[PDB]
């Protein structure tokens, strides 16, 4: 790693060297030539003695570090004020930030891959970090700036459970879309034959029949239509006789096609937006169709909090509820205040104070590590606008009208929606193979038993002493 050399009293990098750096010339690798910074190794900095800051110059020192917040990585730098939380809640967020959904690339509408999630209205975070400007996270954000009243409300929020707002997710809070890929290849068998595509059959004025009313005259699902259960969106027919090798003769036996199309299956319907034909490398046809599905947040969809406060949705609450802070701002997600003492995330608490006072005088604040916005001069910005210094507003309850007997901590938090929705995890089975409620086949080293009855669960019903439930199950 590159560090700054000191020469027995003070740093080599003076004030006149840094004026040129922000004014064009004398960039990096022009500080390695002049002997101002140098690379140090792990077992080679053992023979060193490094200062943390510039008010530490002791004549027994050898090097000076550039920045203290270089210790956090690229994904780990998304957390505002990481030095106020405890470290496991700095680790879990590193597994939750990669799972959050949002904008991926500038050509995300121009590519066809097997699975990707998108966000309809992405917003950049309120408090930034000095390491998320260099990785360009503020150009492609993944999350939503909610407004949060931290209080216990309606009882559907007991442990790790958030309540949501109706008439806020109705206006586009958390609308996502899922795009899946279906690809087919038209194989050229060795015995001079192909597998052709086609269709358009009718039955008694139906143009076409119910199973066929998503296909055009080509036989491929056209752009704009919807697909539901067993309807066919790619009509494919393979020859039934040319599987083995009947060596080439001129006999008329090529009029035998056993059809085997692909069939959409799913709880909720999808839509066709792209389909692409290819004549790929060995002169072989390729068909790639993309199916998109617009999803809204519901009971079971989980969210994060950019500090490791992940939780599932409890209930979508009406808009005439959710106490309304006399100016008239209805909260968007109400969070249980009991998740704070056992988890010890007070750096989240600063995020509202540096966020609520960030909206007012039009400046997106900085929550960078070992620094950022000071809590002293951010409460001064919050207090001369007419608010409390600590963000505690007083609310007027919705179902009864009277005041609430405690001042309730209000302000905006950059939330983010993850994967792992409830729509593709509802898996059930009645009798026989090929279960009737099948989840989407994306497990990826996550086989957590399934619909089984292990030896640990066989030992539980022995302890109850039930003998006929054993023979039944």
């Amino acid at each position: 790693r590159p560090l700054i050399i000191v020469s027995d009293g003070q740093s080599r990098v003076k004030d006149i060297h840094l004026r040129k750096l922000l004014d064009g010339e004398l960039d990096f690798d022009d500080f390695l030539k002049l002997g101002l910074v140098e690379y140090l190794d792990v077992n080679e900095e053992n023979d060193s003695y490094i200062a943390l800051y510039e008010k530490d110059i002791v004549p027994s020192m050898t090097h000076l570090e550039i920045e203290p917040f270089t210790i956090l990585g690229a994904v780990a730098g998304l957390i505002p004020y990481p030095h106020h939380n405890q470290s496991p809640r700095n680790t879990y967020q590193c597994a939750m930030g990669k799972q959050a959904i949002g904008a991926i690339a500038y050509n995300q509408f121009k590519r066809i891959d097997t699975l990707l999630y998108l966000m309809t209205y992405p917003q950049q975070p309120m408090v930034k970090t000095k390491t998320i400007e260099l990785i360009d996270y503020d150009k492609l954000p993944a999350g939503q700036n909610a407004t949060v009243a931290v209080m216990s409300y309606s009882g559907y929020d007991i442990e790790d459970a958030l309540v949501l707002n109706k008439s806020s997710i109705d206006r586009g809070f958390g609308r996502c879309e899922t795009r899946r890929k279906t690809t087919t290849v038209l194989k050229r068998y060795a015995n001079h034959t192909q597998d052709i595509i086609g269709g358009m059959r009718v039955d008694e004025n139906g143009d076409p029949i119910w199973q066929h009313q998503s296909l055009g005259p080509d036989g491929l699902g056209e752009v704009g239509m919807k697909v539901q259960s067993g309807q066919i969106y790619i009509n494919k027919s393979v020859p039934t006789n040319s599987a083995d090798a009947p060596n080439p003769n001129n006999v008329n036996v090529q009029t035998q096609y056993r059809e085997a199309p692909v069939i959409y299956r799913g709880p909720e319907p999808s839509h066709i937006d792209q389909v692409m034909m290819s004549v790929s490398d060995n002169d072989q046809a390729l068909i790639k169709v993309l199916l998109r599905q617009n999803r809204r947040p519901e009971l079971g969809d989980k969210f994060s909090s950019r500090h490791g406060q992940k939780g599932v949705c409890g209930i979508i609450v009406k808009q005439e509820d959710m106490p309304f802070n006399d100016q008239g701002i209805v909260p968007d997600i109400i969070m249980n205040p009991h998740g704070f003492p056992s988890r010890m995330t007070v750096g989240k608490m600063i995020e509202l104070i540096s966020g609520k006072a960030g909206v007012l005088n039009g400046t997106l604040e900085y929550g960078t590590c070992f620094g950022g916005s000071k809590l002293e001069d951010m409460s001064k910005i919050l207090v001369d606008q007419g608010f409390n210094y600590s963000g505690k507003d007083m609310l007027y309850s919705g179902i009864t009208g009277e005041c609430l007997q405690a001042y309730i901590f209000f302000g905006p938090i950059y939330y983010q929606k993850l994967k792992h929705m409830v729509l593709d995890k509802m898996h059930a089975r009645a009798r026989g193979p090929r279960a009737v409620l099948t989840r989407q086949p994306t497990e990826g080293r996550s086989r957590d038993g399934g619909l089984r009855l292990g030896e640990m669960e066989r030992d539980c019903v022995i302890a109850y002493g039930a003998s006929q439930l054993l023979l039944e199950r």
Partner: protein
């Protein structure tokens, strides 16, 4: 009456799978072990498991 009724209902009922209950009542507090280095000694004299 209360002291005899709470004692007569307190006996072990015949047919209770008491081996299965005792095997799970021991192993389930065993699954919440962290490291927890303690000592049956003075000032760090012995490391005991």
């Amino acid at each position: 009456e209360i002291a005899l009724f709470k004692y007569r209902k307190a006996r072990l009922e015949p047919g209770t799978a008491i081996g299965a209950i005792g095997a799970q009542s021991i192993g389930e507090p065993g699954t919440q072990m962290t490291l927890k280095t303690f000592h049956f000694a003075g000032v760090a004299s012995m490391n005991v498991t």
